[PDB]
Structure formats: structure tokens, C-alpha cells
Amino acid sequence: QRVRDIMIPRSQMITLKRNQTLDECLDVIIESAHSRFPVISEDKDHIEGILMAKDLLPFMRSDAEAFSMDKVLRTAVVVPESKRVDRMLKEFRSQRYHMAIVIDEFGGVSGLVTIEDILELI
Amino acid sequence: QRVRDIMIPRSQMITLKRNQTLDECLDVIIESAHSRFPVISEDKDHIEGILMAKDLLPFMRSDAEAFSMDKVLRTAVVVPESKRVDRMLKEFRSQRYHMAIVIDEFGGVSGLVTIEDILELIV
Ligand SMILES: Nc1ncnc2c1ncn2[C@@H]1O[C@H](COP(=O)(O)O)[C@@H](O)[C@H]1O
Numbered sequence: 001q002r003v004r005d006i007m008i009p010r011s012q013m014i015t016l017k018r019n020q021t022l023d024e025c026l027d028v029i030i031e032s033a034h035s036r037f038p039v040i041s042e043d044k045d046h047i048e049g050i051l052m053a054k055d056l057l058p059f060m061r062s063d064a065e066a067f068s069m070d071k072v073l074r075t076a077v078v079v080p081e082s083k084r085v086d087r088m089l090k091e092f093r094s095q096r097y098h099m100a101i102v103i104d105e106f107g108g109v110s111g112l113v114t115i116e117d118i119l120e121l122i
Numbered sequence: 123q124r125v126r127d128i129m130i131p132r133s134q135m136i137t138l139k140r141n142q143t144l145d146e147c148l149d150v151i152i153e154s155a156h157s158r159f160p161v162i163s164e165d166k167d168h169i170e171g172i173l174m175a176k177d178l179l180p181f182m183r184s185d186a187e188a189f190s191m192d193k194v195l196r197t198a199v200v201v202p203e204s205k206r207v208d209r210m211l212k213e214f215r216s217q218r219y220h221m222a223i224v225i226d227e228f229g230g231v232s233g234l235v236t237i238e239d240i241l242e243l244i245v
Pocket residue numbers: 008012013014015033034035036037038114116117
């Protein structure tokens with residue numbers, strides 16, 4: 001199929017805001033139980049990057065630095081809606097990543113796609 | 123293909139001790155980068171459960187209670203090394219879990235196996 005046929009659409013993406021407090025973030029993270037979250041600015045069409053929940057663990061150490069979104073924000077990989085699942089799988093595999101943001105022909109965000117959902121198919 | 127052929131051997135398992143402090147668990151988790159860890163008592167043949175790193179997050183919240191292994195530890199599922207990988211895949215999916223403890227014919231812990239390693243095999 002197309003990446004578009006297996007993606008989590010935009011409105012169902014569980015995201016974080018680049019300005020929220022750690023507590024507000026944790027609330028979302030803990031209750032959604034997901035591992036990676038797109039981080040947005042004004043809305044879900046403007047993704048600043050990706051936050052992986054495991055990157056929060058160093059901040060839990062008793063002698064850790066202060067947490068800030070900038071310390072954990074990763075670059076978001078974007079792919080077109082028309083990208084092929086085979087190619088999508090191959091790319092998750094060779095670049096060793098798990099989530100990509102799907103963009104429409106017009107620069108809007110269509111949804112996210114994960115290696116987990118592809119494998120569940122096969 | 124059997125579990126024995128794809129398991130991570132006991133000697134390479136990254137584990138946590140049931141009586142370890144939060145900092146000590148964090149050091150191990152951070153250094154290894156894994157998501158789940160068998161939790162042991164005396165040694166690696168004495169597996170008490172599995173801990174998922176993400177279950178530690180509620181203790182970072184500002185008004186959280188103090189961390190204790192009791193409230194995050196989950197029961198460990200044990201399988202024999204001769205089990206076929208196809209059956210293992212079906213049990214993981216049926217019982218909705220990601221990591222199992224593998225034992226040999228003497229009942230000793232021989233390793234761990236994960237669904238990610240099985241899926242990786244079938245790509
Ligand atoms: N941030 C997210 N928002 C919405 N769905 C997601 C998110 N992260 C992962 N998923 C979906 O939830 C499934 C479980 O992934 P995870 O929750 O990371 O185990 C994945 O296969 C994705 O389809």
C-alpha cells in the first residue's frame with residue numbers, strides 16, 4: 001500500500017508542545033504510553049522535531065542537568081504520502097529509526113508512520 | 123529455527139537487581155539503552171520479573187511518591203530453548219508481551235528472547 005494507507009492520521013497523533021512543562025509532558029507521555037512523540041509549535045501541521053521518552057531518563061538521576069526540550073529534541077524525518085511501504089520499511093531499517101512524519105503535497109502534516117505498524121502488517 | 127538460535131545468552135543479559143536504588147537502575151538502563159530488563163534476586167537464574175524503563179517515568183513527576191521496584195515489576199514469562207520461533211511469535215502476539223526468559227532442560231536460565239529479534243529475522 002502507500003504510507004498514507006497505514007499511517008496514524010494527524011488528529012490522532014499524540015504530541016507535545018515545545019513550551020509545556022516537564023509535568024505537563026510527563027502526563028501526556030505516561031498516559032498515552034507511547035515511546036516517541038512529535039513536538040509541535042502552534043498546531044499539528046508544524047512539527048519541530050521528535051521527543052523520545054527514553055531520553056528523559058538521564059534527567060531523573062540525582063545529579064542530572066536541568067531538563068529542557070532543547071536538550072532532547074531530535075530531528076523529525078519527513079516522507080511524502082505517496083511513499084511505498086516497502087521503501088518506507090527499508091528506510092526505517094537502514095537508517096535505524098522508528099517513526100516518520102507523513103506530509104501532503106502541500107506541506108501540511110498528514111500523519112505519522114512507524115516501523116511497528118508496518119511489521120504488524122507482514 | 124528454535125529460540126535457542128536467536129536468544130540473547132544469559133551471560134550477555136543486561137539485568138537489574140530487585141533491591142537496587144533508582145540511580146543505580148538508571149545508570150544501567152541509560153548505559154545499555156534497552157527498553158526492558160529482567161529483574162533478579164540472587165543471580166541471573168533467579169528472575170523475579172521484568173521491568174520496562176518507561177514505567178519509571180511516573181517517578182519523575184513533581185508530586186510523585188518514592189520509587190520502589192514492587193510497583194513497576196511485571197511477572198516474567200518462561201519458555202524452553204527448544205521452542206520453535208513460529209510458536210514463540212504466536213505466543214508473544216497472543217499473550218501481548220515482548221520479552222521472555224529462556225530455560226534449558228535442567229531448568230537453568232539460558233537467556234532471554236524478544237519479539238523484536240524474531241521480527242528482525244523475518245524482514
Ligand atoms: N505519538 C503517537 N501518537 C499516536 N500514535 C502513535 C504514537 N506513537 C506511536 N503510535 C502508534 O502506536 C503504536 C504503538 O507504538 P508505541 O506506542 O510506541 O508502542 C505504533 O505502532 C504507532 O502506530
